[PDB]
């Protein structure tokens, strides 16, 4: 019943974070709002591939956007992902 | 440098948890030591497939074992996974 529904909900979030590039994006958005350009410069990633990771994180509800006429700013969306990144940040990001 | 080493270390742990069955096993081991039989009865899983999940979790350092002459008892191993399950438990396991 709920065991398979909650397990699925959590797995969706875990699968979205179980990627080196996707995790680095989320960790950078910890208590911070960044644009596509700011992420591109801080990650050495092509815009085409960076847009693919952002699309995956957006489709699964891990990040939400805000536009400043054409510039898109990204930020962590769900409280579950915010708590997940906060804990991971202290375990691996030295803070 | 460390960015790709720490990201890899965290991804290994996230990939191990990004599975409905593997996550249910870890959640059951939260502050609890259980044998193979106790897990088999509480999860409706075949012993062959349950041993495969336990082997994956063991190889990646998420669980460690203890034997009582022939009975194997499982428990969460790393402090990182213990903190991860503790947070997930409060977000989805209602406690």
Residue numbers in the entry:
A (entry chain A), B (entry chain A): 4 to 98
What's written in the study?
The overall structure of the CM14-treated HlyU is similar to that of apo-HlyU. However, there is an extra electron density map around Cys30 of the CM14-treated HlyU suggesting a potential chemical modification of Cys30. Although the moiety attached to Cys30 is partially visible presumably due to the high flexibility, this observation is consistent with the above result that CM14 modifies the Cys30 of HlyU. To this end, tandem mass spectrometric analysis was performed for the CM14-treated HlyU sample. Figure 6a clearly showed that the Cys30 residue (C#) in the HlyU peptide, RLQILC#MLHNQELSVGELCAK, was covalently modified by the moiety with molecular mass of 130.042 Da, indicating that a certain part of CM14, probably consisting of C9H7O, is attached to the Cys30 of HlyU. Notably, further comparison revealed that CM14 induces a conformational change of HlyU, thereby substantially decreasing the distance between Cys30 and Cys96 from 8.4 Å to 4.1 Å. In addition, we found that the distance between two DNA-binding 𝛼-helices (𝛼4) in HlyU dimer by 2.9 Å, which may account for the impaired DNA-binding activity of HlyU. Taken together, the results indicated that CM14 reacts with the thiol group of Cys30 of HlyU via a putative chemical reaction involving Cys96, and consequently inhibits the DNA-binding activity of HlyU. Altogether, the results indicate that CM14-mediated Cys30 modification substantially changes the HlyU conformation, and thus inhibits HlyU binding to target DNA. Biochemical analysis indicated that CM14 prevents HlyU binding to its target promoter DNA. Further mass spectrometric and mutational analyses revealed that a part of CM14 covalently modifies Cys30, a well-conserved residue of HlyU proteins in Vibrio species, both in vitro and in vivo.
